Amino acid sequence: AMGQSTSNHLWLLSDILGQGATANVFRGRHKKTGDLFAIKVFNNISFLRPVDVQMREFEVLKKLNHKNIVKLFAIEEETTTRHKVLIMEFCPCGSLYTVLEEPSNAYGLPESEFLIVLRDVVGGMNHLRENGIVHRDIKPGNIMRVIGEDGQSVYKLTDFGAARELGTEEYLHPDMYEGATVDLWSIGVTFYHAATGSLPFRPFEGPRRNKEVMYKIITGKPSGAISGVQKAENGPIDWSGDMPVSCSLSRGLQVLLTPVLANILEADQEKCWGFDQFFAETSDILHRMVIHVFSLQQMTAHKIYIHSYNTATIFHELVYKQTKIISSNQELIYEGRRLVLEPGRLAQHFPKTTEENPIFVVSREPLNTIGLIYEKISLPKVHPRYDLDGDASMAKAITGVVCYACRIASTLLLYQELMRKGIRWLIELIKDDYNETVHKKTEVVITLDFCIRNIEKTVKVYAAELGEISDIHTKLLRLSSSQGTIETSLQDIDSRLSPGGSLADAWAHQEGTHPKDRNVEKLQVLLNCMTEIYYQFKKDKAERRLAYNEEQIHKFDKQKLYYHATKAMTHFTDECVKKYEAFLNKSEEWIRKMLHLRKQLLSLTNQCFDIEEEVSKYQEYTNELQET
Ligand SMILES: CC(C)Oc1cncnc1-c1ccc2c(c1)N[C@@H](Nc1cc([C@@H](C)N3CCN(C(=O)CC(F)(F)F)CC3)ccn1)N2
């Protein structure tokens, strides 16, 4: 229907993207070119109208250009109203707030996506700081997303510098609710929200007329606690200086991210960081690369963040911080071959590793098997009330839980398939140690046997030495005999290394789950059915009221969403989880049987080397006879 216009651009007010206090932005096009731009039509601008200062202000912001900041192309005045309109580049993909509405990120964004936002936000925020311009109000609803040429998102800043001539309540700083840290506060709240999927400080009901408690939480924040939430009405505050279990981030990343947030989330400027320390420590985190490590004994995958110029000694040490294995017993395997790392080798030249093909870590010393430990979350109660707004929030919650369950279920299958290979490779590598012990033993055996005969023949070729010649002769059979006693014990190990030898991995090819089971794809089918219903309830919430037929289909759909969820989690716990714990139970035992075999065969190999010294002495010594 009706739609406003300008000299160069036009748009209909139906296509609405954002409703701000001073303005409204809609989806618009250029009057020749037809390209999309965001139209900021200023509403109620007369008592201001500083065509004096804002002219110069917006002209300055126009040429201000960077890849991580929304570009202001032009400022025009409307035809029908003489209103001033900023025309900016259109971000097709929404804001960070829109992505956090997605249930897949209800418990936090993917680790990779978190690094993109973090990198872009700081760089954009840093570009305005070099110009002195500073924001304070940075919020996911104010951080837009577009898709870059490489396909991965690029985040930009967009509605800053609007606080001089005339913070989100949840992202406000304690003293400003009623410098250096006051900047950094809303960003840390943003970063906690992108990693966890929820806000740091939460009263029980929430941000309403009982919001005085919230302010006490912020003002009562002890130490380097990054979060504080009361789980009951008017109850105590559960404080924590670490991140939750539902966090999709790797544990190695949390160790570096935690100090940043603890130091950038505190009201006192005495003990809190500046933009320089902040830019330094996070930029420190982004330049490090990731090397994927799977501890095969304990079944835990790891992401070690290292600078490319760091050595392999701190690498073993940092690995000790996550697997707690001392560097000298840590043994690496890669692409099924053992891997030798010099203590001073740089990380740039490490082999290329992924989570589906990492560097395995094995230890001779026993280690407990932990597995993936994630937080068990059940479904919430579905009320029969028709509150569409309530039905929408409940849809995001219940669908996000199954998203979490489906990611873990996808992680558990990865762990098993990874366990299965690392086990199959390990035995062929330890048998190579077995291929090598008889190996090196054959050098001793024929030299020894013939050596005894030369001494056993010289008695025929030719009282004093004859009595001991026999005695050395007894000892040479004492050792040829012991060469004979261990020889029997190594073929016994060979019977177990053989298929069906009580060490085979056939158990691993049976108990757990496989991609052939297709258990993860099955849950995404039901989970997709649920999200469209979710995005539909938002669409019904936007109407505020629905016609009759649609309200009853909405009541039909809201009930199938519960039935879908129960169907998936039941398939999750009764098939995927249980068959995983059974694969984990038989996993600790087989390593015990493998590490036991590795220590005995170990000894037999040194006993064979133990013996080599004895035949190296009799090799010479007695043939070492001196004579004119
Ligand atoms: C909101 C306030 C902070 O906004 C500003 C304030 N100050 C300065 N700049 C901005 C500013 C600048 C650039 C842009 C935005 C805001 N919003 C942004 N794009 C968009 C895209 C979207 C995404 C979900 N899709 C929605 C469907 N869809 C439409 O077209 C529907 C239609 F057809 F009905 F329109 C295509 C777009 C959402 C929100 N913003 N792009």
Side-chain angles (χ1 to χ4, degrees), residues 462-523:
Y462 284 148
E465 264 280 289
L466 304 204
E468 269 269 333
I469 283 155
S470 153
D471 297 333
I472 55 95
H473 181 95
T474 56
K475 290 74 174 185
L476 267 53
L477 54 75
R478 228 211 279 275
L479 307 183
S480 183
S481 62
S482 64
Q483 179 196 97
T485 302
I486 46 78
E487 161 66 49
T488 53
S489 201
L490 288 180
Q491 57 73 28
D492 175 2
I493 296 185
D494 179 87
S495 179
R496 30 190 312 186
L497 303 211
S498 62
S502 183
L503 271 274
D505 53 340
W507 67 274
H509 277 342
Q510 295 168 344
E511 267 295 16
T513 53
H514 308 80
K516 179 186 179 62
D517 306 333
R518 305 215 60 239
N519 290 331
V520 184
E521 291 84 340
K522 290 173 140 144
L523 295 72

Side-chain angles (χ1 to χ4, degrees), residues 14-18 25 27 38 40 70 88-94 141 144 158-159:
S14 151
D15 311 349
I16 35 165
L17 307 190
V25 172
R27 171 203 196 123
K40 202 149 100 125
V70 175
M88 333 164 85
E89 68 175 304
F90 175 53
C91 305
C93 286
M144 315 265 132
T158 189
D159 172 268

Side-chain angles (χ1 to χ4, degrees), residues 541-605:
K541 179 184 177 180
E543 318 304 326
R544 305 290 301 287
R545 66 218 158 217
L546 296 90
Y548 168 79
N549 300 84
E550 323 327 338
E551 171 101 11
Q552 284 260 328
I553 70 163
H554 176 144
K555 296 172 40 179
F556 272 49
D557 298 338
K558 178 183 178 181
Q559 279 181 56
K560 303 227 75 176
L561 192 140
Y562 165 88
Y563 285 143
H564 282 330
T566 56
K567 184 190 308 177
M569 292 201 40
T570 298
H571 185 78
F572 170 71
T573 61
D574 300 16
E575 175 134 51
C576 302
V577 173
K578 261 196 223 292
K579 294 186 178 183
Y580 156 80
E581 300 248 6
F583 185 92
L584 175 63
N585 177 270
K586 296 184 176 179
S587 178
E588 41 189 349
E589 307 187 1
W590 185 93
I591 80 181
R592 306 170 307 89
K593 308 166 66 181
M594 182 275 300
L595 291 98
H596 174 61
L597 175 144
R598 199 182 187 190
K599 288 214 173 181
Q600 294 338 271
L601 182 142
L602 160 69
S603 152
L604 300 74
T605 71

Side-chain angles (χ1 to χ4, degrees), residues 152-178:
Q152 287 131 32
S153 317
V154 179
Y155 291 84
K156 306 177 172 276
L157 312 180
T158 189
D159 172 268
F160 58 99
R164 210 65 192 164
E165 206 81 54
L166 288 182
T168 311
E169 63 281 82
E170 303 92 7
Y171 302 76
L172 277 178
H173 184 97
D175 301 298
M176 292 183 17
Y177 203 58
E178 181 178 359

